[PDB]
Design a protein around this ligand. Structure first.
Ligand SMILES: O=C1Cc2cc(Nc3ncnc(Cl)c3Cl)ccc2N1
Ligand SMILES: O=C1Cc2cc(Nc3ncnc(Cl)c3Cl)ccc2N1
Ligand SMILES: [Cl-]
Ligand SMILES: [Cl-]
Lengths: 124, 4, 124, 4
């Protein structure tokens, strides 16, 4: 086509989706990770995660307002990944890298899994 | 704005 | 903070939100523009438009499944802007620029209004 | 991935 493109548009959309999440506006699901609860937008979760994409395209699960993750999932690892989904920024640290990589593998977030593997390999 |  | 950032994350999220729109997945509103209907996600519309942000933060309108736009709004102009919201690409042409600018002004999409004004000024 |  002969379209023009606004370079900062995708980043501006994601920034506003994060502002809606912070103010709890039009969040339509709560993700339960052991004792912890995280409110989010189903569309953003699906857009970022192979696991959520599979869950919310399922004809029965698409209608659930609560999703319980596997008990082995670490709430902090989930929190870091949820923040990444809404910001593009990953808070990866020596103290959380193992939990973040395990959560990214479960959530099917291949680019996160890739950077965790590389950061771990460098420390060996 | 750019030509993509 | 000490975060790392994935450059293509925002663009990848927007690409997946557009794929969900094309397959009509978790769309929660229909925008009526005269005889034409457009299905979309309320969160994306709010993230892109000052008008939709005001509409869906309203305690009564947030729950509506149908929104009717002003009869002066051109369906093609709306279609071009809806495509821009989901892709960052604006199909701006001599034949549609006046309708696109008028629709962007109504929808409160300031960056689109700005490029339309500049493209019009250059043709004068 | 980059340092933002
Ligand atoms: O590593 C990842 C990140 C990811 C996201 C999604 N999401 C979607 N993919 C295709 N079309 C649609 Cl409509 C969506 Cl929402 C699926 C798989 C994976 N894997
Ligand atoms: O030109 C534009 C594009 C636009 C988007 C929005 N959206 C939001 N703004 C602030 N926080 C939130 Cl939560 C959202 Cl969704 C508001 C005004 C405007 N004007
Ligand atoms: Cl990822
Ligand atoms: Cl805009």
């Amino acid at each position: 086509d002969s379209c023009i493109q606004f370079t900062r548009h995708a980043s501006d959309v994601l920034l506003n989706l994060n502002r809606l999440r912070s103010r709890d506006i039009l969040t339509d699901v709560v993700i339960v990770v052991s004792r912890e609860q995280f409110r989010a937008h189903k569309t953003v979760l699906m857009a970022c995660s192979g696991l959520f994409y599979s869950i919310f395209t399922d004809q029965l699960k698409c209608n659930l307002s609560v999703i319980n993750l596997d008990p082995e999932i670490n709430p902090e690892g989930f929190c870091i990944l949820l923040d990444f989904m809404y910001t593009s920024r990953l808070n990866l640290r020596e103290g959380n890298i193992m939990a973040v990589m395990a959560t990214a593998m479960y959530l099917q977030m291949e680019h996160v899994v890739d950077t965790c593997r590389k950061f771990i390999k460098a420390s060996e | 704005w750019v030509i993509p």
